[PDB]
C-alpha cells in the first residue's frame, strides 16, 4: 500500500498516450503525430 506524493509541477498541456508536456499547445499536437495512426491504444480509466 503506497501513497500519492507522485508528480511535481504538471503543465496544462500533457499527452495521455505516453505522457509528455509542452510549453505550447501547437507543439503538443505535433508530438501526437507519433501516436496518430500508430498502435493507438487508449487507456481504460480516465
Ligand atoms: Zn505522447
Swiss-Prot record:
Record localization: Nucleus
Superkingdom, taxonomy of origin: Eukaryota
ZnF bounds (C2H2-type): 13-35
Task of the protein: May be involved in transcriptional regulation.
Family assignment from sequence similarity: Belongs to the krueppel C2H2-type zinc-finger protein family.
Name the record gives this protein: Zinc finger protein 347
Section covered of the full-length record: 340 to 372 of 839
Amino acid at each position: 500500500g503506497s501513497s500519492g506524493s507522485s508528480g511535481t509541477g504538471e503543465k496544462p498541456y500533457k499527452c495521455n498516450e505516453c505522457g509528455k508536456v509542452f510549453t505550447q499547445n501547437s507543439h503538443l499536437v505535433r508530438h501526437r503525430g507519433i501516436h496518430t495512426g500508430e498502435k493507438p491504444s487508449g487507456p481504460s480509466s480516465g
